[PDB]
Amino acid sequence: ITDDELKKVHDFEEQCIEEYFREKDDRFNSSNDERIRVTSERVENMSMR
Amino acid sequence: SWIERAFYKRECVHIIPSTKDPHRCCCGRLIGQHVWSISKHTQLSPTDAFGTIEFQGGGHSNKAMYVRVSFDTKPDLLLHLMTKEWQLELPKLLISVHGGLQNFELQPKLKQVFGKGLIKAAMTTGAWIFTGGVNTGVIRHVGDALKDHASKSRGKICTIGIAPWGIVENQEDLIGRDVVRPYQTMSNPMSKLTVLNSMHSHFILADNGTTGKYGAEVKLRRQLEKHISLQKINTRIGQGVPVVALIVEGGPNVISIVLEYLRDTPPVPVVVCDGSGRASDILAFGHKYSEEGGLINESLRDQLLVTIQKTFTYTRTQAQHLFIILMECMKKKELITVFRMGSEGHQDIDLAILTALLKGANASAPDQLSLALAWNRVDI
Amino acid sequence: ARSQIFIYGQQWPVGSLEQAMLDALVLDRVDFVKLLIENGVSMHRFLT
User: Fold this and answer.
1) C42–B57 CB contact, under 8 Å
2) Bridge partners of B65?
């Protein structure tokens, strides 16, 4: 590759690596399993309050 | 190569007046570091500082374009630069964020709600955010808001900040012609100069020749906002782009900025926030205790005078002058939208901002519907 | 260390953050490395 298209390839790789990590985080929180964990913590803090 | 041949710059070639410190000139630079025309005698030259900035450190890596532009340039050249060379489409909304240059801290809930509002407003309408450029105060809060937005979801918020060229730290690090220059986020607490905000997208550096002093960017930013607002929006029903003015905290100068926004053809709505303090809090206390606009009785007038003289530590005549400026602002009381934490103040930044834009246009409901269609906001 | 030491208005000696990075790297503290990168330390200027 030429140095100009090397940079374009390079920033393409950073769009992909950010979109992969972000997605993994969104699919973790959409997880029913985590929509239940993060509900329980809250419920207790309203129960004492 | 068009940027060097189209945009110009100015450098300090003066008689070196010492004033207080013999090394510090009228431009504030060192006496041997040299190399308007009144007392600075500046010369005009093609620019040597433009391109791309790679923000090293500060968590996420973000690349922001920059260009050093003379302060007396014409907005059509700059607007053509953003539309063509930076490949930025014409925005459906312009937001002008003003505030205090000193650093301040807000309530955590207020900061979170203001940040979420600014992020969602600049996402849904595809707006442009205009800040002060450097990483001080309200622009630092906007930078933390852009941290959050990016940290949570993807999105390219166009957040063109306009800063003085002579006040940014490491001016030699940003010297190049279409070259990617690394930048350091570290800000020396001893140095009076402040670094640029790491989470911005474009930077219109405005050199008036001087270093370490403000005022080199306000007129250029205002005339660029005017030149943007005279451009017609893509609906072609007969309206330009809407301009809002978000005010967080601020000092004595932002009242004059608000007065310049109100007493303008066409008028610009102003949205303020409560709980930050200083000029925004006195604006809110004026707005709740106002009756029929400029009809303010004596007791709240004296309360406003003593709160101005207490918070801003001004004299009696300075507080009186600021109160006349407040009343001249208060004549156009319908344009100001005050956001309040809690209560019934729309419970969100964005309903307040978009409602303020809708009644700041003050046009027919076809024009409001075309604005909402351009912003892709069915709920509003 | 995030809430107290890296609070706003904290003065830092020159070269102290690079020595703190060198101590964090050898003592397998990945969260402290993440904190220091986010607080302005750049790896390009640190690594020799």
Assistant:
1) yes
2) B52, B202
Q: Do chains A and C touch (3 or more CB pairs under 8 A)?
A: no
User: What is the residue whose two structure tokens read 């003379």?
Assistant: B70
Pick the closest to residue B52 from B37, B69, B64 (CA basis): B64
Q: Does B43 touch chain C (CB under 8 A)?
A: no
Residues 6+ apart with CB under 8 A from C24: C32, C33, C36
Look at residue B224 and give its three-state secondary structure.
helix
- Contacting subunits of B (3+ beta carbon pairs below 8 A): A, C
Give the single-character DSSP code of B81: I
User: Touching check for B5 and chain A: CB below 8 Å?
Assistant: no
**Beta-bridge partners for B98:** B247
Interface test with B, best of A18, A20, A23 (most B CBs within 10 A): A18
C38 has a chain B CB within 8 A of its CB = yes
Mutate to test the interface with B, among C7, C10, C41, C43 (most CBs of B within 10 A): C41
SS3 state at B139: helix
Which has the closest alpha carbon to B97: B207, B212, B254, B220?
B254
DSSP B262-324: HSSSS---EEEESSS-THHHHHHHHHHS-SBTTB--HHHHHHHHHHHHHHS---HHHHHHHHH
Q: Kind and range of the H or E element at A47?
A: helix A32-48
CB-based contact, C11 to chain B, within 8 Å = yes
Q: Are B297 and B308 in contact (CB under 8 A)?
A: no
Residue B77 CB contacts under 8 Å (≥ 6 apart), including other chains: B6, B7
Tokens of B217: 């960017």
Chain B hits for A22, Cβ within 8 Å: 153-154
> Structure resolution in Å?
3.2
From residue B268, how far is each of B95, B128, B158, B184, B325 by CA, in Å? 11, 16, 21, 37, 17
H or E, element range at B165: none
Which candidate, B336, B353, B321, places its Cα nearest to that of B118?
A: B353
CA–CA gap between residue B341 and residue B343 (Å, rounded): 7
Contacts of B127 (CB under 8 A, 6+ apart): B91, B92, B93, B94, B95, B121, B158
* Tokens linked to B160: 């063109």
Which of B184, B187, B194 is the best substitution to test chain C (most C C-beta atoms within 10 A)? Answer: B184
